[PDB]
Amino acid sequence: EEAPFVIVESVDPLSGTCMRNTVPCQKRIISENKTDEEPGYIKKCCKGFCIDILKKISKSVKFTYDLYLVTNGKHGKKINGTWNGMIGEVVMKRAYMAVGSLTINEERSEVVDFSVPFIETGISVMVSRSNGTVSPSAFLEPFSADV
């Protein structure tokens, strides 16, 4: 789940399924470690930019699919030579493809295959707009020394 690209919410209380223009994702739940239960899954609805890209792409290279949300990790991290998140799910052959806000870098490109990019990103800095203006010598701006 990422706010503008993958948005997930619960199914219609009236019908118990997903609304139009959405896709179903199944999520897994883990109870307390003292005692756990047989497979427990919850059905959700997934929509967004990447979901629309996955829908058009799927209809012309012609394949069917099922979606599920990752539980261990968020995006991918190498700890003691092991990967988690979506990257780790793809490495363990548990998933075939990963769709979402995953950035292409050299470290991950040595363990999985990336396709051409569909949007450009990077690193940015966000600050709060300070109220007021800047004017150290505004009173000298009009006219010129010659006059």
Binding mask 79-118 toward ligand NAG (x if CB under 6 A, else -) reads -xx-------------------------------------
Distance CA 17, CA 45 (A): 8
Residues 61-80 close enough to bind other proteins by CB under 8 A? 61, 63, 73-75, 77
The minimum distance between CB 89 and other proteins, in angstroms, equals 9
By beta-carbon proximity to other proteins, the closer residue of 34 and 93 is 93
Distance CA 141, CA 143 (A): 7
Closest CA to 118 of 5, 3, 1: 5
* 117 part of the interface to other proteins, by CB under 8 A: yes
Applying CB under 6 A, the span of 7-15, 99-107, 110-118, 126-134 interacting with ligand GLU comes to: 99-107
* 112 part of the interface to ligand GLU, by CB under 6 A: no
- Binding partner of 81, given ligand NAG, ligand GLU, other proteins, none, CB within 5-8 angstroms per partner class: ligand NAG
Tokens in use for 43? 């059905």
Question: 44, 25 in Cβ contact below 8 A?
Answer: yes
* 75 part of the interface to ligand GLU, by CB under 6 A: yes
The dihedral region occupied by 48, where left means phi > 0, alpha psi between -120 and 50, and beta the remainder, is: left
Residue 94 assigned to a binding site: no
Distance CA 33, CA 14 (A): 34
